[PDB]
Write an enzyme that holds these catalytic residues in place. Sequence first.
Site, PDB file in Angstrom:
ATOM      1  N   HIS A 140       0.840  -1.194   0.000  1.00  0.00           N
ATOM      2  CA  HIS A 140       0.000   0.000   0.000  1.00  0.00           C
ATOM      3  C   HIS A 140       0.877   1.246   0.000  1.00  0.00           C
ATOM      4  CE1 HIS A 140       0.121  -0.423   4.473  1.00  0.00           C
ATOM      5  NE2 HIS A 140      -0.164   0.864   4.529  1.00  0.00           N
ATOM      6  N   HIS A 171       1.512   3.790   2.077  1.00  0.00           N
ATOM      7  CA  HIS A 171       2.139   4.407   3.261  1.00  0.00           C
ATOM      8  C   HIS A 171       3.674   4.224   3.321  1.00  0.00           C
ATOM      9  CE1 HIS A 171      -1.952   4.223   5.602  1.00  0.00           C
ATOM     10  NE2 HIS A 171      -1.854   5.301   4.849  1.00  0.00           N
ATOM     11  N   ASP A 216       5.761   2.923   5.439  1.00  0.00           N
ATOM     12  CA  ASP A 216       6.306   1.639   5.881  1.00  0.00           C
ATOM     13  C   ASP A 216       6.310   0.612   4.748  1.00  0.00           C
ATOM     14  OD1 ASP A 216       3.443   1.904   6.249  1.00  0.00           O
ATOM     15  OD2 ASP A 216       3.402   0.312   7.748  1.00  0.00           O
ATOM     16  N   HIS A 266      -7.360  -1.506   5.636  1.00  0.00           N
ATOM     17  CA  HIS A 266      -6.487  -0.511   6.268  1.00  0.00           C
ATOM     18  C   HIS A 266      -6.348   0.713   5.361  1.00  0.00           C
ATOM     19  CE1 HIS A 266      -2.762   1.087   8.123  1.00  0.00           C
ATOM     20  NE2 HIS A 266      -2.226   1.072   6.916  1.00  0.00           N
ATOM     21  N   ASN A 303      -3.710   2.839  13.164  1.00  0.00           N
ATOM     22  CA  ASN A 303      -3.905   4.029  12.335  1.00  0.00           C
ATOM     23  C   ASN A 303      -4.979   3.808  11.286  1.00  0.00           C
ATOM     24  OD1 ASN A 303      -3.768   6.342  10.726  1.00  0.00           O
ATOM     25  ND2 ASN A 303      -1.966   5.607   9.597  1.00  0.00           N
TER      26      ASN A 303
HETATM   27 ZN   LIG Z   1      -0.465   1.859   6.302  1.00  0.00          ZN
HETATM   28 ZN   LIG Z   2       1.658   0.434   8.877  1.00  0.00          ZN
END
Ligand SMILES: [Zn+2]
Ligand SMILES: [Zn+2]
Length: 230
Positions: free
Chosen positions: A83, A85, A87, A148, A179
């Site tokens: 995804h 993000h 990380d 998520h 989150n």
């Molecule tokens: Zn994420």
């Molecule tokens: Zn994450």
Amino acid sequence: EYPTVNEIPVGEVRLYQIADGVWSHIATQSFDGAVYPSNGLIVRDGDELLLIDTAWGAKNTAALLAEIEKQIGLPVTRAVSTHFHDDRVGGVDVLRAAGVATYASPSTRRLAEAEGNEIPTHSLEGLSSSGDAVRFGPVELFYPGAAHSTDNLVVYVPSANVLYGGCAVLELSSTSAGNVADADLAEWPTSVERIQKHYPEAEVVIPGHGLPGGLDLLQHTANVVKAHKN
Ligand SMILES: [Zn+2]
Ligand SMILES: [Zn+2]
Ligand code: NA
């Protein structure tokens, strides 16, 4: 045993062997002050490696490449980010500069661009609709639906029956969904049900943060998210 945040200083990466030719990688990073562990996956494909997710930042990702060379000794030739993000994509520029071909869905690439994150070079087509599945080297990539994030992908390694859930899946000790700024809480449990239906034979399930476990991580995730949404 499986490393935790206390055993990995920010900047170091550990590898953990899950099965023949399958490892997780574990790194730590500070986010909003606090340190968290993060997992990704490494899968052998002949004499090369497929990387799933960065190690959450350029320095961690350079350390990841170094640790791979030391411990495994095979080149990483491709990477997929699950995804948009940091990380998952933070470190993509390091990978690309090292000669690794980086990939993500078109949705992930657009969202990364919008967020000011690094952007994988190549698009992964055929993953636009919930339930879509495509082969990519030694893994199957699966789009379970929004969870998520709207773009989140999961990764199955057929040879080992290992399911890497990324952040669409939570570890068993988790009491909250974490989150959820970009999450779709209404859809997430349905997305998990799609994973359960499509990979009933999975023996190991690896979350994006925290400890691997069995198939119960899937139901647990649905439960937490439902309880969170209330
Ligand atoms: Zn994420
Ligand atoms: Zn994450
Ligand atoms: Na490499």
